[PDB]
Design an enzyme around this catalytic site. Structure first.
Site, PDB file in Angstrom:
ATOM      1  N   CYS A 280       0.814  -1.211   0.000  1.00 16.18           N
ATOM      2  CA  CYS A 280       0.000   0.000   0.000  1.00 16.18           C
ATOM      3  C   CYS A 280       0.833   1.239   0.000  1.00 16.18           C
ATOM      4  O   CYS A 280       1.737   1.381   0.797  1.00 16.18           O
ATOM      5  CB  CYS A 280      -0.948   0.060   1.190  1.00 16.18           C
ATOM      6  SG  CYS A 280      -0.189  -0.436   2.746  1.00 16.18           S
TER       7      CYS A 280
ATOM      8  N   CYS B 159       0.559   3.695   3.188  1.00 13.50           N
ATOM      9  CA  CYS B 159       1.220   3.224   4.373  1.00 13.50           C
ATOM     10  C   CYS B 159       2.626   3.724   4.535  1.00 13.50           C
ATOM     11  O   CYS B 159       3.129   3.776   5.639  1.00 13.50           O
ATOM     12  CB  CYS B 159       1.180   1.716   4.388  1.00 13.50           C
ATOM     13  SG  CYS B 159      -0.478   1.101   4.039  1.00 13.50           S
TER      14      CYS B 159
END
Ligand code: ZN
Lengths: 116, 998, 49, 50, 34
Positions: A39, A42
């Site tokens: 991700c 993140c």
RNA sequence: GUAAUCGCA
DNA sequence: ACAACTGCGATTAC
DNA sequence: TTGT
């Protein structure tokens, strides 16, 4: 680690570690972060968690759990998406706060100070 | 594991080299040491190699640089000496010597001097197979085998088979004889070799066979062999195979080898040099051990191991290496960029390498192999052009001594992505395409065509066949070239000039970041080493100018700052705090900002308003007209610190004495001196003053005076007592003066795009041309340089800078932005200017009729100029070369002892030289008297010169000298020392008499 | 080696019997010319030779 | 000084026929590459033509 | 050796055969003109 | 006073 | 065996 | 080295 300091202060715990931490007794607030290498958001969340761990040296415990290694555990925790933060209070009667998406560091500080 | 997803550290090369050295080279050298046994009883001493342990330095770096001491580590190894009579081996640990340690920046401290180890490019050992065409007949083919020591076992073939080695100076040598001497029985030789018909039809040793591991591998590659890596020796099978290939080349079955290919070259790092120095030191140590054993036998004493070994060889070897080796140079610290660019140099010239004259033209050109591994626009200008080059940003040094570059793999696989540091020889057999994929022609995207590289060639192929892709933008350049914004719009020739001129910048009193940049200034300032980076997380509890206190995990760490220090190139170094008190800092963030760095980015100049127009001739050629605002606002002010030191050398007759009261000197001087013979801190001094006063008895007055141009405040003075030299050593008094230098006519200024100039006039702001805003331009440049030197990126920069200044933005643009579309730079520049014009309603910034150009007025008359001019705010740097340093003038002061000509050098107050190319011009003009005067009484004629001052003071005419100059007299004396006579012997035409002139 | 270029857009009209067929050094087919020929570029308004 | 000649980005004027010429040249190059892959021409002819 | 013996050796050992090449007009023109 | 090394134009 | 740009300036090492 |  005596001569050279560790670069990262947040440790990757497993699901059994989280279960033992929640089952046991805590004297400091607990913050659980679910992340995945894939991700994009993140990458930023990790930097803010590093800053928060630096700001809270020993007054709070910050751990991170990889969703790729523990997918069933993350699914059982009702985690919709990756930038999710679980705020566990020290007293075990209060309710945990779950936050989703990128949130400002000041919001995390206020949550830890007041809600937890 | 690192550098495959981000730009690697600029100093990682020296770091990993020193690490590999300490890890394995010390043990490898200690293993090969022989057992000292030189006696009839054979008393044997041994060094337990397993018990090898280095010890931390006793002093710190800040003490080593202050006390002019080396920063090294103590090597302690346990040794066992088995005495002859004792019949037993006593085991003790001995101090062999000191081994210098490297800083995290790559530099080493030896005798208080910062020194760097430049890498060297040397040809790898192996078999090379060159060919040479004869004047008449078939082309001659030769194969050379190269050894680690440098042996050349050549092999040649004539029109016939004629497999002849060129080892002997004679005509030739029999390959069959060499094979038979090797061990071949003349039957297995023909049985094993291919094409045995050709071989059968035809009817020192250790160094040549000292092939390295690298040599073994290469031999195996070119000549298919299954010899194990371990057997690093010239086997006869290798020779046999070599012969086979050689004969095969005659029939067309072969390929000659390119000796300019990187795969055929090795890189020697600091580890390779330190390993050889340690081996030489071990040899010296073994010799000293044998000598001291021989002496102890003479003195009838069995000594302890400590008595045998002395700490002299290691220390003296490393000191001599760092002092006199051609690959150990003092670090250039003019600016933070120099410290990083100095350690990336790769040099062909050096010990065991091509000398300037020796180097062929071929050696100095780019080879397709240099792509991504070496910089194609960074060289050394001069006779060594193409021999000294830098190292690519993303390069690494490989296991086999080969530079490696990161290539993405677009081929489909399990991971589907890889970043591999392919070696030079491997990337040749791959389709490497640097183009993008944003093209569709109603067919599958993999059917599109793209330029690519294959077999050291360029070609266009489909996207199905491309194996690799070069994604990194800064892969093919170096730190110097990458700091040039809009490098695509500038010529390749001017890129070298800009890279060389970026190195000259002077750190200013104040620093400002650049509006337009490439984005590499951040990592440049990070790896420069002039920045305070925390090594621990915590909070800044206390903030002070001298030190910073960082409290973390119940521990407080103190970081000492740098306050107005001095570099090797007379440039000030200073640090300022960036973080305020009470904020958290991670392990790696910036605590303080050093010189020429603000906000964590390299800042070597200022941003000033610039107009490109001719102004009254003041811009002719290259010359800049600047305003007084740069002067009275301290825009380009800089601080320069120069040191002067005189040692109190103690002579055998009498030691030098430092006294303040010295007679025979005027009372205008000596005011600055204290009770002791030294100047006081905070004292303003000038030319001709006395800094240190010494009696010098041996009385006299060997003092320290200031030279021409030295006018600065005395910041600090150091009394340095010298110890550790095995005896009492002279004290050293070092004074430091700080000269504040402003911008002046004669100073050089430059831009990052290769534009260089010298200031010619400082006009006031009222005379300067002003825009429609009302502001006078800071500098005016000549617009005719753009077509001459082909620098178009400067225009872009200027415009983007104006736009940024108005909109308060900073642009960090990666090079080659035209990979996205066409005219990407133009679109970006015009878009940002329009926005600026709309937001701050200054319509002038973007003119629809002529984008990027505005119409300015004249400050003198007030009338507008006919044509529009370019208005922008580029990044201008101030270069190190400065007029004050270059000013010089001599009347009549000092002469050489033997030549008696005037002295050389500006510091020595010497005149200028009239060379042969100027005597020729003087003779062509016909000025015989001027040439005679310059050749006799302004240079060498002692009597005439003595008389010149008297005749000039009185006012009389200077007579023409008739005697021979001291240079001729010297020649006569020399030639007569060589038993050769020389007499003038002029003959008078009147009375026919010979008269000798002596 | 001067290269003749079309003055305007139009059709090319010439007698192919005078020119001899040949193969160019670029691998392309072409007509070799050895005698003075007149070619006409037929455009909207004008003819070029 | 009075006229103040200067050079800018938009002042570098290309001939109005560069695009057509480059396009037809690259089109012929692509056609020749395609026919070289087919085998109608060999390497030296392609090199000379380009 | 001779072309006949070499062709026989090719046919016997290496599997050579004069297979028909179905060329395009441009390929035939290239083979004939060069 | 000589070397080494870099720069300059 | 011989020669292969002209000079200048800075540093450190002897 | 490069050539003389
Ligand atoms: Zn561009």
């Amino acid at each position: 680690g005596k001569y050279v300091r560790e670069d990262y202060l947040v440790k990757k715990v497993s699901a059994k570690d989280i279960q033992e931490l929640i089952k046991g007794e805590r004297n400091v607030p607990l913050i659980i972060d679910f992340y995945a290498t894939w991700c994009g958001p993140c990458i930023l969340m990790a930097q803010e968690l590093e800053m928060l761990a630096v700001e809270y040296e020993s007054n709070a415990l910050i751990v991170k759990v990889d969703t790729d290694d523990e997918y069933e555990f993350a699914r059982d925790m009702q985690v919709r998406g990756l930038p999710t933060l679980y705020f566990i209070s020290p007293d075990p009667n209060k309710d945990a706060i779950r936050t989703e998406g990128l949130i400002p560091i000041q919001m995390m500080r206020d949550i830890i100070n007041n809600d937890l | 594991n690192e550098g495959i997803s981000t730009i690697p550290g600029f100093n990682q090369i020296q770091f990993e080299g020193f690490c590999r050295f300490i890890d394995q080279g010390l043990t490898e050298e200690l293993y090969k040491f022989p057992k000292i046994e030189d006696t009839d009883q054979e008393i044997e001493f041994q060094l337990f190699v397993e018990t090898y342990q280095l010890v931390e330095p006793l002093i710190k770096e800040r003490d080593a640089v202050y006390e002019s001491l080396t920063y090294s580590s103590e090597l302690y190894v346990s040794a066992g000496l088995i005495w002859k009579n004792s019949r037993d081996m006593q085991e003790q640990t001995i101090f062999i010597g000191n081994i210098p340690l490297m800083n995290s920046l790559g530099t080493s401290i030896v005798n208080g001097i910062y020194r760097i180890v430049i890498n060297q490019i040397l040809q790898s050992p192996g078999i090379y197979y060159r060919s040479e065409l004869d004047h008449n007949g078939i082309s001659v083919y030769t194969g050379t085998i190269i050894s680690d020591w440098g042996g050349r076992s050549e092999l040649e073939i004539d029109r016939k088979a004629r497999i002849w080695a060129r080892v002997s100076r004679k005509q030739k040598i029999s390959i069959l004889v060499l094979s038979s001497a090797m061990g071949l029985n003349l039957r297995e030789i023909l049985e094993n070799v291919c094409y045995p018909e050709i071989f059968l039809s035809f009817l020192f040793f250790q160094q040549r066979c000292e092939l390295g591991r690298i040599g073994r591998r290469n031999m195996n590659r070119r000549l298919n062999l299954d010899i194990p890596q371990n057997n690093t020796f010239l086997l006869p099978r290798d020779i046999l195979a070599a012969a086979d290939h050689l004969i095969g080349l005659k029939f067309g079955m072969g390929a000659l080898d390119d000796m300019n290919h990187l795969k055929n070259k090795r890189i020697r790092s600091v580890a390779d040099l330190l390993q050889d120095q340690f081996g030489l030191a071990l040899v010296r140590l073994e010799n000293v051990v044998r000598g001291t054993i021989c002496g102890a036998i003479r003195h009838k004493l069995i000594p302890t191991p400590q008595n045998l070994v002395t700490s002299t060889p290691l220390t003296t070897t490393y000191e001599s290496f760092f002092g006199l080796h051609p690959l150990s140079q003092v670090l250039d610290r003019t600016n933070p960029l120099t410290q990083i660019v100095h350690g990336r140099k790769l040099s062909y010239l050096g010990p065991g390498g091509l000398t300037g004259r020796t180097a062929s033209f071929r050696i100095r050109d780019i080879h397709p192999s240099h792509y991504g591994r070496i910089c194609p626009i960074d060289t050394s200008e001069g006779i060594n052009v193409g021999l000294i080059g830098s190292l690519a940003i993303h390069a690494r040094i490989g296991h086999w001594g080969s530079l490696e570059s990161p290539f993405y793999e677009i081929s489909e696989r399990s991971t589907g992505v890889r970043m591999l540091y392919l070696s030079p020889g491997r990337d040749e057999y791959y389709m490497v395409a640097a183009g993008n994929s944003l093209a569709l022609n109603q067919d599958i995207q993999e059917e599109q065509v793209v330029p690519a590289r294959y077999r050291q060639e360029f070609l266009t192929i489909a996207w199905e066949q491309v194996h690799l892709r070069s994604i990194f933008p800064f892969q093919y350049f170096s730190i110097g070239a990458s700091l040039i914004p809009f490098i695509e719009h500038n010529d390749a020739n001017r890129a070298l000039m800009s890279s060389n001129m970026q190195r000259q910048a002077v750190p200013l009193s104040r620093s400002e970041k650049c509006i337009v940049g490439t984005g590499l200034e951040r990592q440049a300032a990070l790896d420069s080493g002039a920045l305070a980076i925390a090594e621990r997380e915590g909070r800044v509890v206390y903030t002070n100018t001298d030190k910073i206190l960082l409290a973390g995990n119940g521990d407080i760490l103190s970081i000492p700052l740098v306050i107005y220090q001095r570099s090797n190139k007379n440039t000030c170094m200073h640090q300022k705090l960036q973080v305020p008190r009470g904020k958290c800092i991670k392990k790696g963030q910036i605590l303080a900002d050093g010189a020429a760095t603000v906000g964590g980015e390299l800042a070597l100049g200022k941003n000033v308003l610039v107009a490109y127009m001719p102004w009254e001739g003041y811009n002719s050629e290259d010359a800049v007209l600047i305003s007084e605002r740069l002067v009275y606002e301290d825009i380009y002010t800089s601080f320069h610190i120069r040191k002067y030191e005189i040692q109190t050398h103690v002579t055998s007759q009498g030691p030098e004495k430092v006294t303040n009261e010295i007679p025979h000197l005027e009372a205008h001087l000596l005011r600055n001196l204290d009770k002791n013979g030294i100047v006081m801190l905070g004292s303003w001094v000038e030319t001709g003053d006395i800094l240190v006063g010494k009696l010098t008895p041996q009385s006299k007055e060997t003092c320290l005076k200031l030279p021409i141009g030295g006018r600065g405040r005395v910041i600090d003075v150091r009394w340095i007592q010298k110890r550790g030299g095995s005896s009492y050593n002279p004290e050293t008094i070092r004074v430091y003066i700080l000269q504040k230098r402003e911008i002046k006519v004669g100073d050089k200024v430059a831009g990052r795009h290769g534009n260089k100039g010298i200031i010619s006039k400082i006009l006031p702001r009222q005379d300067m041309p002003y825009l429609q805003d009302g502001r006078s331009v800071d500098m005016v440049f000549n617009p005719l340089g753009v077509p001459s030197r082909m620098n178009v990126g400067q225009i872009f920069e200027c415009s983007l800078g104006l736009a940024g200044s108005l909109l308060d933005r900073h642009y960090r643009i990666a090079p080659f932005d035209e990979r996205y579309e066409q005219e990407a730079s133009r679109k970006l520049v015009f878009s940002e200017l329009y926005e600026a014009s709309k937001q701050t309603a200054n319509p002038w910034v973007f003119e629809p009729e002529y984008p990027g150009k505005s119409r300015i007025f004249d400050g003198r008359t007030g009338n507008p100029f006919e044509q529009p001019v370019i208005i922008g705010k580029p990044y201008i740097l101030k270069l190190i070369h400065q007029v004050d340093d270059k000013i010089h003038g001599r009347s009549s002061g000092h002469y050489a002892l033997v030549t008696q000509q005037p002295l050389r050098g500006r510091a020595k107050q010497g005149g200028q030289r009239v060379g042969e190319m100027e005597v020729w011009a003087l003779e062509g003009f016909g000025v015989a008297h001027i040439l005679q005067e310059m050749l006799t009484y302004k240079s060498d004629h002692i009597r005439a010169r003595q008389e010149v001052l008297g005749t000039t003071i009185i006012g009389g005419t200077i007579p023409n000298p008739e005697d021979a100059p001291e240079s001729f007299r010297l020649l006569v004396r020399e030639l007569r020392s060589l038993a050769l006579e020389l007499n003038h012997f002029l003959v008078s035409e009147k009375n026919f008499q010979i008269n000798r002139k002596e | 080696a001067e290269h003749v270029r079309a003055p305007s857009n139009g059709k090319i009209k010439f007698n192919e019997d005078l020119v001899h067929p040949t193969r160019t050094r670029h691998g392309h087919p072409a007509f070799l010319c050895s005698i003075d020929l007149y070619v006409t570029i037929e455009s909207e308004d004008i003819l070029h030779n | 000084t009075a006229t103040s000649i200067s050079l800018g980005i938009d002042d570098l004027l290309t001939i109005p026929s560069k695009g057509w010429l480059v396009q037809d040249a690259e089109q012929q190059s692509l056609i020749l590459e395609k026919h070289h892959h087919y085998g109608n021409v060999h390497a030296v002819e392609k090199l000379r033509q380009s | 050796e001779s072309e006949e013996e070499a062709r026989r050796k090719n046919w016997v050992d290496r599997g050579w055969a004069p297979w028909e090449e179905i060329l395009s007009p441009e390929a035939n023109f290239a083979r004939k003109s060069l």
